Each structure stands twice: as C-alpha cells, then as structure tokens.
Amino acid sequence: QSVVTQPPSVSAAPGQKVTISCSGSSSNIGTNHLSWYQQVPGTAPKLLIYDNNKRPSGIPDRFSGSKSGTSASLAISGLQSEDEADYYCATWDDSLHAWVFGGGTKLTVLGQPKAAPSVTLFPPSSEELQANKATLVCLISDFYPGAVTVAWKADSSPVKAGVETTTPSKQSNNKYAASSYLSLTPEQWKSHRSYSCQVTHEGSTVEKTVAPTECS
Amino acid sequence: EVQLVQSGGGLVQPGGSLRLSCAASGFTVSSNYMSWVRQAPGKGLEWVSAISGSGGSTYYADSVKGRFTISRDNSKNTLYLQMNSLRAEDTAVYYCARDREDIVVVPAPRGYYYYYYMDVWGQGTTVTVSSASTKGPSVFPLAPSSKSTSGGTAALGCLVKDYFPEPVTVSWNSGALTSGVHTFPAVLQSSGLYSLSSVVTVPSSSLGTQTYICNVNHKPSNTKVDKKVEPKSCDKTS
Amino acid sequence: ISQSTASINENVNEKCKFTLPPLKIHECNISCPNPLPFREYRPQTEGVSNLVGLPNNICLQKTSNQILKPKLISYTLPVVGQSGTCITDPLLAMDEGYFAYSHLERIGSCSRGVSKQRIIGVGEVLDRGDEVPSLFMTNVWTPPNPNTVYHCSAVYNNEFYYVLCAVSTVGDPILNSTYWSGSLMMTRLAVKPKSNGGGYNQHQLALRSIEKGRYDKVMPYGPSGIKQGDTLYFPAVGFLVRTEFKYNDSNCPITKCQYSKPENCRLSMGIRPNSHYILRSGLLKYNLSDGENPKVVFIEISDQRLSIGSPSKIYDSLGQPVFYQASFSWDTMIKFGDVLTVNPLVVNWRNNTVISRPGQSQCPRFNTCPEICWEGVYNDAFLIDRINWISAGVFLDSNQTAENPVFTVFKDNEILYRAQLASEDTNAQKTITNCFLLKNKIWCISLVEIYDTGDNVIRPKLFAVKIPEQC
Amino acid sequence: SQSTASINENVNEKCKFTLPPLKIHECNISCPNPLPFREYRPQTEGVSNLVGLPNNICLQKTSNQILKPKLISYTLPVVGQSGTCITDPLLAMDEGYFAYSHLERIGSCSRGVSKQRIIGVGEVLDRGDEVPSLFMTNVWTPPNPNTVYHCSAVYNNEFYYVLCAVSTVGDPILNSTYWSGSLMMTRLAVKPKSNGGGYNQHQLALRSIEKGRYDKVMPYGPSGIKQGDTLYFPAVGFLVRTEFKYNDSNCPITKCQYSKPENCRLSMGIRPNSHYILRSGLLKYNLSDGENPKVVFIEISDQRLSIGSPSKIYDSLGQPVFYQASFSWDTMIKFGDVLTVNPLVVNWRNNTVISRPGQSQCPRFNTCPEICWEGVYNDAFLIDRINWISAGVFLDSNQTAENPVFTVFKDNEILYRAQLASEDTNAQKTITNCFLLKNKIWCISLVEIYDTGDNVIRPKLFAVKIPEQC
C-alpha cells in the first residue's frame, strides 16, 4: 500500500513546541484531507485534528495541524505529561480505497524529573542449558522518560534475531523500565566470545558485557 | 453517551475464525460508515475493513481481502466482523470506529470538499491467534554478574519463563518484603508463551546475610516452585 | 402513317403506365365515417423537435410574476431507487427529440463509494401522456470498468447518439493530466433500438488517431455537441503545455482593477498557477464520412475572451450553433454566444453582464477582474430566441456557495423571469439545460445535480420547464 | 391495322387501372415492434395487490379537494402519428402486473382503418417519486387487427392470460349470428426472457368450449380473476332468444308507468328482435385440465338480470368482486361480492349514487325497464371491504359521455370526488384498478379522454392515491 511516513520518535522538553510531520503520496494526502490521532498505549485511539486544522469538541488549542502539498504537519506546543503518546496521522486514499494511517510518532515529552537510564545484566545458570535452552536476561529501569532502545552485540555483530525488547513500563517509582530477552541455544551460547546488552536511551548508550563463563 | 463497545474477542487457534461484535450506543450505525482498525503489539495502527453507511459496500485492506467479512445488524445496532482463516499476524486489538464523513458542496470543478475522519472509537478487544495451554512456569534463579555482585546494590532475581496464561504470583520470602521488586511485563516469546523476570535491589552487604526466597506461584495450574536465590560468582570449570 | 401510329402506341405505353411507389394511407386524404381532423401531416411536428423555425412567442417583459412552472420529471431517468447510491457526473444531450444521458453510480458515499455503474443511456424525449415532455430511456450502455470512463459528451446523428468519453486509468484526467494517456472511446447508441440489433443497438467506435496539432492531449469536455451534416462536433478541451502557450501578457484586461497583475490571465489558464498543462477549450471534429475509422480533429477555440478550458457546449438553436463555455476562472460572467465559424472556432461571445456563476473565495460571482482561480460550476444556458436574443438555463444564485438552483430567462443585460427549482440552501452543482419544441412550444428540460442533505448523496433532478407565452 | 386497335384496347385495359378493392379482414397488417426494449428502470420495487392490512383512507364525506390524481405516464409511450386514434382499452391489474391492449386506428376512432392491435403486459412499478405507473415489459401484436375483438385478461403465475375473440364479421356483438364463435387465448409472460418465444408470448387455441346451453360464448370485459389454477374471465354468452326463459313477473316494473313488462326480456339482446340474447357471466378455464383445457362458461345468476355488458370480476380484499357494466335499462352501478363463482350468484350492491351516461332512452339514474342498448363501462374497484367503500372513474353527465370524475363512494354516499379533465371533456371507457404501493391505496385508472380539436387520441392514465387524511 502507500505507507504514509512520519518521524517515528521525536522528543522535547515540557512547555516546548514540537511539530509532527506526515508525508505521503499525492493520491492520499494531496487529494484527500488528513486527520490526526493520539494514542496513549493501552488506551483507545483519540481524535485530535481533522480537515488538517480543525478540532473535535474538547481538545485544547495546543494541537495545531497543517498540510502542505503531499505532506502534512501536527504542531504540538507546550508539552504536558499526558501529551506523551503515539501520534497517528490518518487519511483516505482515493486510489487504494482505504484508510491510510501514519507510521506513528512516539512523542516523548518529559513532565517527571528526567530519569538517568540504569542498565543491569544477570546471566542464565547451568539449569537453563540442561533444559536445552539458553536465554539472556537484561534488566533496565529507573529511567525517565521512555523510548529506550536495547541493542545486542555478540563480538560486535548486531544481533536482533531472538531479541524481544519490552516496552518502558511504569513502576512503583513511576519511572520507565524495560526488559530484553535473547532466546538462544546452549550451543549458540558457547559459540561466541562475549554478549553485550547495548542500551541506548535517547542517546544515553550503556553497553554491559558478560562472558560465557558465568552461570547464575 | 456516544460510544462503541466490543465483545467476542479472545483466544483463537490459527486458521480458525472469530466473529467480533461492536455494540453501538448513542447513534445508529446505519447512517455512518464503520471501520475496523487493528494494532499488533509493537506496530502502529492498521486499517482493516469498512462497512458503508446505508448501502452494501464492504471495503477491505489488501492484506485481509478475502479472509475477513464485515457486516452489520441494524436491528441489533451492532457492527460485526466475520474474521476467517486467521493468520498469526492478526494477533491484535481490533477497534471498531465509525467513519463520520463531512461533505459540503463547493462552487468548484472538484465539486465537493469531503474531509473525512474517524471519531467514535470502541474499546477494542484482543484477537490472540496462537496455541493454548495451562503451562506452569520454568523457574530459574537470577544471581548477580561480576559487574553486579561486588557493586553497591545487589540486583537479586528469579527467572519466570515458559508459562501460559496470565497472571503469575511471584513473592519474596512469602511476601515478607515486597519492596523494590521489579516485576517485569510478560513478553511474547516465539513459543506462544509469556516469560518474565522478577529482580529486587537489595544491598550487596545484605548478600549472604538475609535470606531472600523468590516464592513462585501459579494459582490456576496449582504450580509453586520455591527457589533459593543465592549469590553466584563465576562458574569456573577452569 | 403506321410509324406515327406506333409513336402514339409508344406514348400511351409510356404515359399511362402506373409504376409507382406504394401508397401511403396516412398521407392521402382518408374519409371514414364520423372522422377525426386531418389538420396537418408533417414529420417532427407530432413529437419533440429542435428549436428551429419560428416557435411560439415567449413572454418578453421583465416581470415579478411566477410564470415558469417547473415540473420534476426526474423519475424518467435512473436517478431514483435505493438511497444508498450517490449519482455523479450527469450528462444530458437533446437533438430532434432524442436524448442521451450518462451518470456514474456509486454505492454509499459520494467520495469513495464503490463505483457500481456508468450507465450511458439514450432514448426519446416525448410527451408520455402526462402533458409534459418526459424522457423514455430505452438503450442503455454500461462499460466494463466505470472507474475509467470520464467526461463523456454526446452528439446525435442519423438515429444514433454518438457518445465520446475519455478512458482514464489515472483518475479524472484533468486532475492527473500529466500522466493521462489521452485515450478516448466513442460509444454509438441507437435512439430507436431494434430488437436483436447486435451492431445497430450499441456499437464501440475505435479512435486510434487524433488530430491535435500543437496540443499534447485533447479530451471531450462538456455535455452536448452538434452535428453538421455528417460531422460531429464534440465540445472539448485542449491540454496545451504552458511553456508553449504563446500569449502576449499585455493582452490581459488588468485595467479597471487595482489588484490584478499582467500575469494572472496567463497563469489561470491552468488548474493551478504552475499547471503543466493549459486547458484551452474547443471542439472535436468527427466527420462520419471520412472513411473507415474517421479521425478526431481538435479545433482550438479563438482567443477572444479566452479563459481556461471549462466544460463546453455547442448546441444547435434556431439555425446557427451556439457555443457555451463555463467560467472556471476569473471571467465569472457567462461566456457563451453564437458560433460565427466552427472550423476555426470563433464565437461571438455575448456581452453578458447579469448571469454569472458562483465560485469560491478567490473569484466569486459577478467578478470580472483577472485573478488566479480554478473556480466555478457548469451552469448552462440554452438559446431560445434570436430576434430578441433571449436565453434560458439554471444558475446557482449565490455569491460564493453552490446552492439555490434557479431556472432563469435572461437577455445579455437583463433577467426577465426566474423560477427557483428548490430551496435557497439546496446545494446544487452542475446544471445542464436543453430546450426544444413540443407542438411549437419551447419546453426546456433542465437537469440539475442536487445534493440531498438527508441522504448525503448527489442526485440529478430533471425539470421540464415550459417557457411561458404571456404574463 | 387490326393489330393496332387490338394492342390499343389491350393496353388501355391493362396498362391503366390499378387495383380498387380493399380486403379489410384478410390482409395481415405488419407494424414494427412497439416496445422492442423495456424502459430502463433502476430495479425499483413492485406493488402488491389490495389485500389484507387495512391501510387507512379517508372514509368521511369530505367536500375538500383531497384526491390528487397524478396524470401519469401512458402505458405504451410512443409518438402518436397525426389523426391516428387509439381505441378499445383494456387495463387488468393483479399482483403487481398490468395487462394492456388497445386498437391503433387510422382515421376515425369508431369506424376508421385499424392499423394495429396492441396486447401488452408489464409491471406496475413505482415510477420513482413514490407514485406508481405502468412499465410495459411484453407486447404482442396480432397479424390482423381487424379480427381480434373483446379481449379480457387474468394474471396467474408469471403469465397474463389474455383471452380474445377472433372474428371475421366485425364486432361479434353486432354480427353475432354470423360470428363463428372462435376464441383465442394469448398468454403473455410478465417477465419476458431473452430467448424462448413460447415462454414469452403464447397463443392458446381453444378447440374445446363448453358453451353449455349457449350458442356462442366470448370474453367481454377487461379484467378477470384467478382462483388457484382456474382463470375466470368475464364473458357474455349468446343464447338464442326464444330459448331464453324469463317470466315477465320478474321484470321490476312497479313504481313505473312507462315500462311494458316485457322490456327486461326484450333488452337482453341488442335490439328487441335480435337473434341472440346477451347473458353476462364468466369463462372458467382450469389450467390443470391438460394440453387442451376447455373453457367452461359460467352464466351469471338470474337476479337483477340485465344484458350481458362488458364486465369485470376482480379480487379485492380476499373475496372476488364482480363488476358488470350497465348497458341496459338498469343504469345504476351493478357490482358486488361474488358469493360463489361456479354457480355465479352475486350480491349486487344497492347503489343509489353511481351510474353511467347513456342516450335519451336510458339516461343516467335510470332503474326502470326501457328497451335500450346503451351506456359505458365505468368500473369501480373495491378499496375498503369493511365499510364497503369503492373507487372508480365515473362520467358525470346525464346524457353525454363526458366529465370523467374520479370518485370514492359508498352505497348511499359519494364521499369525495376528483375531476380528471374539464367538464365538457368527452370520455368513454374507464378502467380503475386500485392496489397497494407501500401500503397506500393507489388507483391507476385509465380514462379514454377524447380531445376534440387536437391531441392525437389516446387514453389518459391517472394514478390516484386514496388519501389517508380527510
């Protein structure tokens, strides 16, 4: 289909201004008007802008839309804590006869004391290999805000097969927290020299490397 | 007031069928278009299908054409969605929402304006296309590493892998200290299973002095596996 | 002696021989008991005929008397039925008592509903016993892909309507004109169809050769055209590349307007000021006796009062063709007049001050100043007099909103009498007026797109209006 | 010499003198197909027969103009040639279909040259603005229009059974002795297919005819009924006059002074020395009889007996209502419930308000025996059975056939009226067939309106919604 593109993740301080662009073809955005949807995770999507600049009844004025040519925009000024969500531009394609949603903009406002990223690493023991499975465990928490990225290097080769990185999750300290798991075999565990949990949070990159000589 | 309510979501085996419903409140679905939007966990919104306000037009996304069937009952005031031949990529939360279209006639060669939006969204129920069990977890202790044992705080934990379904009960010392316990969210494996860990930030001086017991319990399958969480250093076979 | 006798024999043999075509019982004077009046036997004085000759005297004063009494005859076309259909792009040609009609039929919403049908239907205009010239659609064509047939246009010629349309796999080929192929289809439809015709009833004429000249793409554009003998004149538009639109910029009537520029009427010859193509109107020539597969020749319109190629209508009224061109740019006064010459096309555009079309904010109604806009509607006018030069059509009486369709009757400098066809806030967009003669009365059938606010669909409503004779 | 005058005589005999004579009834007239293709309709809904749910009408006697008769689209909309007249109309509606037949006649209307007989059936659809009109789907034309006289029609089971009388002696009423008694039945499908001419239009030969006691039977009247598999056309039977039993004590001559008590017996033939007597009735036609189904005549019961005039049995609100035209001294409208079909006893209503126009012998509002054969067919469809309210188009002049007024009436009361034309507008034969469209009582009513000075002669259809509110 015509996958209308957005910035996947932009971030700004509270009170600041951010503008969320929305670029696609001429058959869908150039011909037909566009509509905006914020979507807090775990919550129904919410209508923000339609007709590229109007609002439904009950939206504050700090959500501003635009459309220029085959591209559109969502300006968000004066960030608050509940404006941190995913922002979806949606329009109808007269060619595909379909709704076309945007790729999603994870707007990362602040709103809580910025949390330094904390990264921790604990390996599987003798027991997991005996069961025929080896699973890496990396635990990341105490970080504000969210939108964390955990990369994986086994001898500096980027490994993303078998990596399952969770979402940043609200804890009892209301911080962001995510876990990652690399499902492997004991053979692929002992076939390498090192395993690194490279955790990048908005540029804050932490790489913790253990050896395959330790069992928990 | 004006609200859509889903029903009929839940766990389904792959290739099968599940019919979702959309209880409509505050209006009539005969006058407006209605649409289904899904979202897999980890992706953005994806449109699925649309039924026409009065008329019989059924639109489908190009990946779901010929597998899903949208219909409605005007007497019941309920949008349906007959999903058939369910692939595992249909594992999502399906949102029924109306597509309220606003058209004015404008003195122009384009004739009419037609900005066009979805406003009233349903709660959205979960379609889970997977296998099924009542599997008790595979309990493993999680002992600190070399950059986690001789530090300032000790992140003592316990691995909860290979269980289904949710939830799971994990306490420490039969609940004698529940403080600081990072109960991680369950992640969807490539086995149709959830898997988590549960780590606690105790001091490193408390290692070998205070007994911390990750008491795992699974209440539906009567599964409890109590593991002694101890500090491991490097297993050296030399 | 005997030779003169034989000459008498031969002359009797030559003169008193009755080798004759068969008698016609209706032509001859027939005298049956308790008779009916014979009054006059003339063809096309019994049904619906064109405006030709000397019709009945229409009312000529300007009056405040509601004298136009329109009759909704919309049931005579397939515009009714289920209300989940939005009915778009109508068309209404009328020659000699036969019509053509064509709409696109979409299921659901007007904008994105699934395209059901492009019915291209011809028929007969007649009085169907209800004392009102109604339509009677018999022969109906529907193409195998109604999303590719755009901008049809229709001409009647010898028991067929010929309908020329544009085959566009890239949407409305004005709007995506740089990627259009220019391919056209000619549908020939019998107005009195034979049972078991096969090639007589509905035929497809393959147009493999277009004469454009300096234009890159031409397209039929507007409802109805004319025939002149064996030659069809489809109203049309030329797609001229803007860099080749040679046009001296000082020609623009920038005086009497402080806000125009010497660029404007050069710029607004395209749909947007940097349009790759410029829409110049014209005709398409289809001379039937060119041979097997006659070619289509574009005739560019002359540069007098030149504006953007809008949907055009050449129609034969009272002996001489009248060309109409809608005002899809700044010259918002109505742009129509008698055709001086057809090839090359030169129209004596009427100096019309009173009839204008509504457009949106940039070039509204009653605007003369050269602005850049692609704005306005096809509101048609038909010629119903030449001694006084009266015309009639349906026009949307509002400055900037596409509403209030009013059938009105006007000179070049005066509106005589009106009839609003609906409520003042009735959204209406494209009106097509054709007039004709029914027992030497000037009846005008006025198709009007109307947007029903309840059903949220667009639906053509026909208004057979008799042009009244007194006041 | 001699050969000179021989050639001269032979040439002047033969090279001159084109053929005078006119065979009328012998030369089949071929005209083009008057409706080759059905009018394009956008799959609009049909109508249903007037049965069941009492959808409310005005039943008060209102003087207000509450009827709105839409002059609607004619049955066969072609362009009329000048001087051409259209006569002998038939309009039979049952179960959302009509049948239609007219004679297209060059010259005059009464005695002119007849150029074609239309016999056509179709659908009574909604025309589009919630008004019904007749959309012709099938039309048959006889090879000779000068033979086919007095058709009748009955809907049954995706066909419309049109029974006609094949004459070669002119009007088999008027040349009844010399009339051969042959009939024909034309089966016209109402959903005509592409191929399959036997399915589309079928001509049913009637070589077994149970006249019973009668000498010649023919269909006579527009519209009949079905009952299951059995068609019951209206008819008239020609019985030899001296065979007709009629005690002159049963001629209602009390409260009169100018009725001889044999007038009832005399007037049942055309003229009171006619060879035949016209007895109204039905023609049974059981379709389940075989490949040669016989046509049983069913004589009408001998109560209030008049000359067999063209009549109409119709099924309105469950029970069949028979209408018989008043071509006799008995001029009041003579219609009512069919108590039993075979034998045919009909409870006639005691109407004191509806009649027909006839000549000076038997005018409008005549209940006294005079010898006459005059009057017009103005039927009445039953619209409300509970109050016995009926509706039809009745001419509203005493001695002349003019002013066609749509009327809704009871047995003692005309409720509310509607002129269909001006007061001096001549009209003859009106065929009202009320029915249900969207549970509204609509009455598509043909009227043979004659416009004198102009306006090439056709009948004028009139869809009339019976008003719900007074």
Side-chain angles (χ1 to χ4, degrees), chain C residues 405-423:
Chain C
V406 172
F407 185 87
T408 183
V409 170
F410 61 96
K411 292 190 172 67
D412 296 330
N413 296 318
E414 183 176 357
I415 280 173
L416 293 170
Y417 42 82
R418 300 184 185 179
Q420 53 179 355
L421 298 176
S423 64

mmCIF file of all heavy atoms in Angstrom, chain C residues 405-423:
data_model
loop_
_atom_site.group_PDB
_atom_site.id
_atom_site.type_symbol
_atom_site.label_atom_id
_atom_site.label_comp_id
_atom_site.label_asym_id
_atom_site.label_seq_id
_atom_site.Cartn_x
_atom_site.Cartn_y
_atom_site.Cartn_z
ATOM 1 N N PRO C 405 -30.393 26.477 -6.961
ATOM 2 C CA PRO C 405 -30.504 26.413 -8.421
ATOM 3 C C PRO C 405 -31.755 27.140 -8.877
ATOM 4 O O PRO C 405 -32.854 26.877 -8.394
ATOM 5 C CB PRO C 405 -30.567 24.914 -8.710
ATOM 6 C CG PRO C 405 -31.068 24.336 -7.497
ATOM 7 C CD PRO C 405 -30.546 25.147 -6.367
ATOM 8 N N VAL C 406 -31.569 28.107 -9.761
ATOM 9 C CA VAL C 406 -32.646 28.938 -10.255
ATOM 10 C C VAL C 406 -32.670 28.798 -11.760
ATOM 11 O O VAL C 406 -31.697 29.148 -12.430
ATOM 12 C CB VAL C 406 -32.471 30.398 -9.853
ATOM 13 C CG1 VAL C 406 -33.491 31.234 -10.540
ATOM 14 C CG2 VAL C 406 -32.609 30.542 -8.388
ATOM 15 N N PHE C 407 -33.762 28.272 -12.292
ATOM 16 C CA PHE C 407 -34.012 28.351 -13.720
ATOM 17 C C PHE C 407 -34.414 29.776 -14.035
ATOM 18 O O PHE C 407 -35.406 30.277 -13.497
ATOM 19 C CB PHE C 407 -35.112 27.380 -14.121
ATOM 20 C CG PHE C 407 -35.374 27.307 -15.599
ATOM 21 C CD1 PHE C 407 -34.667 26.451 -16.412
ATOM 22 C CD2 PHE C 407 -36.348 28.084 -16.168
ATOM 23 C CE1 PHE C 407 -34.934 26.386 -17.753
ATOM 24 C CE2 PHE C 407 -36.600 28.033 -17.501
ATOM 25 C CZ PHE C 407 -35.897 27.181 -18.293
ATOM 26 N N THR C 408 -33.646 30.439 -14.886
ATOM 27 C CA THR C 408 -33.930 31.826 -15.190
ATOM 28 C C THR C 408 -33.808 32.068 -16.681
ATOM 29 O O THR C 408 -33.197 31.289 -17.414
ATOM 30 C CB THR C 408 -33.013 32.769 -14.426
ATOM 31 O OG1 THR C 408 -33.387 34.113 -14.716
ATOM 32 C CG2 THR C 408 -31.626 32.576 -14.851
ATOM 33 N N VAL C 409 -34.414 33.170 -17.111
ATOM 34 C CA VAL C 409 -34.554 33.526 -18.516
ATOM 35 C C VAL C 409 -34.103 34.971 -18.680
ATOM 36 O O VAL C 409 -34.664 35.875 -18.052
ATOM 37 C CB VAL C 409 -35.997 33.337 -19.000
ATOM 38 C CG1 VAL C 409 -36.179 33.913 -20.343
ATOM 39 C CG2 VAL C 409 -36.346 31.878 -19.061
ATOM 40 N N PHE C 410 -33.117 35.188 -19.548
ATOM 41 C CA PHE C 410 -32.305 36.389 -19.482
ATOM 42 C C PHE C 410 -31.918 36.892 -20.863
ATOM 43 O O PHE C 410 -31.702 36.109 -21.786
ATOM 44 C CB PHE C 410 -31.037 36.118 -18.670
ATOM 45 C CG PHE C 410 -30.143 35.055 -19.252
ATOM 46 C CD1 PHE C 410 -29.072 35.389 -20.042
ATOM 47 C CD2 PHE C 410 -30.330 33.733 -18.948
ATOM 48 C CE1 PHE C 410 -28.255 34.432 -20.548
ATOM 49 C CE2 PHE C 410 -29.505 32.784 -19.455
ATOM 50 C CZ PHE C 410 -28.468 33.139 -20.245
ATOM 51 N N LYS C 411 -31.759 38.205 -20.972
ATOM 52 C CA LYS C 411 -31.059 38.814 -22.086
ATOM 53 C C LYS C 411 -29.590 38.967 -21.717
ATOM 54 O O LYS C 411 -29.128 38.443 -20.707
ATOM 55 C CB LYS C 411 -31.641 40.172 -22.438
ATOM 56 C CG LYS C 411 -33.000 40.168 -23.005
ATOM 57 C CD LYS C 411 -33.297 41.548 -23.514
ATOM 58 C CE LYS C 411 -34.574 41.584 -24.271
ATOM 59 N NZ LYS C 411 -35.690 41.317 -23.358
ATOM 60 N N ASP C 412 -28.838 39.700 -22.531
ATOM 61 C CA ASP C 412 -27.449 39.973 -22.189
ATOM 62 C C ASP C 412 -27.319 41.000 -21.083
ATOM 63 O O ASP C 412 -26.244 41.145 -20.504
ATOM 64 C CB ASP C 412 -26.706 40.471 -23.410
ATOM 65 C CG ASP C 412 -26.625 39.444 -24.490
ATOM 66 O OD1 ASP C 412 -26.600 38.240 -24.170
ATOM 67 O OD2 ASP C 412 -26.595 39.852 -25.669
ATOM 68 N N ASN C 413 -28.367 41.758 -20.821
ATOM 69 C CA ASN C 413 -28.254 42.857 -19.880
ATOM 70 C C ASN C 413 -29.406 42.886 -18.894
ATOM 71 O O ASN C 413 -29.602 43.909 -18.231
ATOM 72 C CB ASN C 413 -28.193 44.184 -20.621
ATOM 73 C CG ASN C 413 -26.965 44.308 -21.481
ATOM 74 O OD1 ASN C 413 -25.866 43.936 -21.077
ATOM 75 N ND2 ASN C 413 -27.143 44.830 -22.682
ATOM 76 N N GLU C 414 -30.168 41.804 -18.782
ATOM 77 C CA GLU C 414 -31.409 41.816 -18.028
ATOM 78 C C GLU C 414 -31.863 40.387 -17.798
ATOM 79 O O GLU C 414 -31.766 39.556 -18.703
ATOM 80 C CB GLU C 414 -32.473 42.593 -18.790
ATOM 81 C CG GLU C 414 -33.773 42.745 -18.114
ATOM 82 C CD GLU C 414 -34.684 43.617 -18.933
ATOM 83 O OE1 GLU C 414 -34.230 44.113 -19.981
ATOM 84 O OE2 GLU C 414 -35.851 43.799 -18.550
ATOM 85 N N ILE C 415 -32.328 40.103 -16.585
ATOM 86 C CA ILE C 415 -33.033 38.866 -16.266
ATOM 87 C C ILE C 415 -34.522 39.153 -16.316
ATOM 88 O O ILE C 415 -34.997 40.103 -15.690
ATOM 89 C CB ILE C 415 -32.608 38.310 -14.900
ATOM 90 C CG1 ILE C 415 -31.285 37.574 -15.017
ATOM 91 C CG2 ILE C 415 -33.651 37.416 -14.309
ATOM 92 C CD1 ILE C 415 -30.733 37.159 -13.691
ATOM 93 N N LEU C 416 -35.254 38.344 -17.076
ATOM 94 C CA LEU C 416 -36.664 38.611 -17.308
ATOM 95 C C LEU C 416 -37.535 37.975 -16.240
ATOM 96 O O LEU C 416 -38.326 38.654 -15.578
ATOM 97 C CB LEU C 416 -37.046 38.092 -18.683
ATOM 98 C CG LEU C 416 -36.365 38.877 -19.774
ATOM 99 C CD1 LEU C 416 -36.568 38.197 -21.087
ATOM 100 C CD2 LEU C 416 -36.984 40.238 -19.784
ATOM 101 N N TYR C 417 -37.413 36.665 -16.072
ATOM 102 C CA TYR C 417 -38.191 35.946 -15.080
ATOM 103 C C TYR C 417 -37.472 34.671 -14.690
ATOM 104 O O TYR C 417 -36.815 34.027 -15.509
ATOM 105 C CB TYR C 417 -39.604 35.645 -15.573
ATOM 106 C CG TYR C 417 -39.674 35.191 -16.998
ATOM 107 C CD1 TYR C 417 -39.439 33.881 -17.355
ATOM 108 C CD2 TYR C 417 -39.965 36.095 -17.989
ATOM 109 C CE1 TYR C 417 -39.514 33.488 -18.658
ATOM 110 C CE2 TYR C 417 -40.028 35.718 -19.283
ATOM 111 C CZ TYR C 417 -39.794 34.417 -19.618
ATOM 112 O OH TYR C 417 -39.865 34.070 -20.941
ATOM 113 N N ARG C 418 -37.606 34.332 -13.416
ATOM 114 C CA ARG C 418 -36.912 33.225 -12.797
ATOM 115 C C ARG C 418 -37.906 32.195 -12.298
ATOM 116 O O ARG C 418 -39.116 32.420 -12.271
ATOM 117 C CB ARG C 418 -36.093 33.686 -11.599
ATOM 118 C CG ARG C 418 -35.032 34.684 -11.853
ATOM 119 C CD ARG C 418 -34.328 34.896 -10.553
ATOM 120 N NE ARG C 418 -33.328 35.941 -10.608
ATOM 121 C CZ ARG C 418 -32.610 36.306 -9.557
ATOM 122 N NH1 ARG C 418 -32.793 35.692 -8.398
ATOM 123 N NH2 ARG C 418 -31.712 37.273 -9.662
ATOM 124 N N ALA C 419 -37.353 31.071 -11.857
ATOM 125 C CA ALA C 419 -38.083 30.107 -11.044
ATOM 126 C C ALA C 419 -37.049 29.337 -10.254
ATOM 127 O O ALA C 419 -36.261 28.603 -10.851
ATOM 128 C CB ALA C 419 -38.894 29.164 -11.896
ATOM 129 N N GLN C 420 -37.043 29.497 -8.939
ATOM 130 C CA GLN C 420 -36.122 28.711 -8.144
ATOM 131 C C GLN C 420 -36.608 27.278 -8.060
ATOM 132 O O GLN C 420 -37.773 27.013 -7.757
ATOM 133 C CB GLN C 420 -35.923 29.327 -6.765
ATOM 134 C CG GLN C 420 -37.140 29.610 -5.971
ATOM 135 C CD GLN C 420 -36.779 30.195 -4.638
ATOM 136 O OE1 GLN C 420 -35.604 30.297 -4.299
ATOM 137 N NE2 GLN C 420 -37.781 30.593 -3.869
ATOM 138 N N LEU C 421 -35.723 26.351 -8.387
ATOM 139 C CA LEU C 421 -36.103 24.960 -8.516
ATOM 140 C C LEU C 421 -36.172 24.239 -7.187
ATOM 141 O O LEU C 421 -36.704 23.130 -7.131
ATOM 142 C CB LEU C 421 -35.111 24.234 -9.399
ATOM 143 C CG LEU C 421 -35.054 24.775 -10.803
ATOM 144 C CD1 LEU C 421 -33.996 24.040 -11.507
ATOM 145 C CD2 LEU C 421 -36.343 24.552 -11.468
ATOM 146 N N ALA C 422 -35.641 24.827 -6.130
ATOM 147 C CA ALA C 422 -35.596 24.175 -4.839
ATOM 148 C C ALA C 422 -35.493 25.263 -3.786
ATOM 149 O O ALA C 422 -35.721 26.443 -4.066
ATOM 150 C CB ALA C 422 -34.429 23.190 -4.774
ATOM 151 N N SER C 423 -35.160 24.866 -2.566
ATOM 152 C CA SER C 423 -34.969 25.833 -1.504
ATOM 153 C C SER C 423 -33.673 26.599 -1.725
ATOM 154 O O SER C 423 -32.810 26.199 -2.506
ATOM 155 C CB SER C 423 -34.949 25.134 -0.151
ATOM 156 O OG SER C 423 -33.837 24.263 -0.064
#
